Structure 1
Amino acid sequence: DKNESATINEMMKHLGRSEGNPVIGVFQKFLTGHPKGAAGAWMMNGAL
């Protein structure tokens, strides 16, 4: 959660995302838990 936060934050910082316009995090695994392989397919379904 720290590594991920840091890498997203640095992606935005480098591409000059506006100060005061943070991305809004969703953490779907709070509800579902972590199904290994399927983890990202559930996140995609949620994104859609």
Structure 2
Amino acid sequence: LRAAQQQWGNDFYKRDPRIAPLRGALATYGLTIDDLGVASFHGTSTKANDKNESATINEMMKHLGRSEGNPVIGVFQKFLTGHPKGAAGAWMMNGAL
């Protein structure tokens, strides 16, 4: 039963080159790419980082057909905390939650 739920519920997109990992992840719960409301950005206040990260998120959204007029809202927690190197993602994840 668990294997059948894995095939049809959890892992239906793993062998499907027409479904991005990002899209599959959301589609598991019936969400679309338009339901990704917030992007917690690494957002380190470096020239290179903040541009590359914006460009990357932006290209992901464009490729997956995110609706025109529906930008992800960026959060940049490090404005307040600074960059704790290895803990950076964990603080962002806590924020995200």
Larger radius of gyration: 2
CA deviation string 1:1-48 (max 9, x = no partner): 000000000000000000000000000000000000000000000000
Structure 2: gaps of 5 or more residues: 1-49
Larger RCO (alpha carbons 8 Å, 6+ apart): 1
Could you list the structure 1 runs, at least 4 aligned residues long, displaced by more than 6 angstroms after superposition: none
* Structure 2 equivalent of residue 44 of structure 1: 93
- Percent identity between the aligned chains? 100
RMSD: 0.2
> Matched residue pairs, number?
48
- Decide which structure has greater strand share: 2
TM-score of the superposition, structure 2-length normalised? 0.49
Structure 1: gaps of 5 or more residues: none
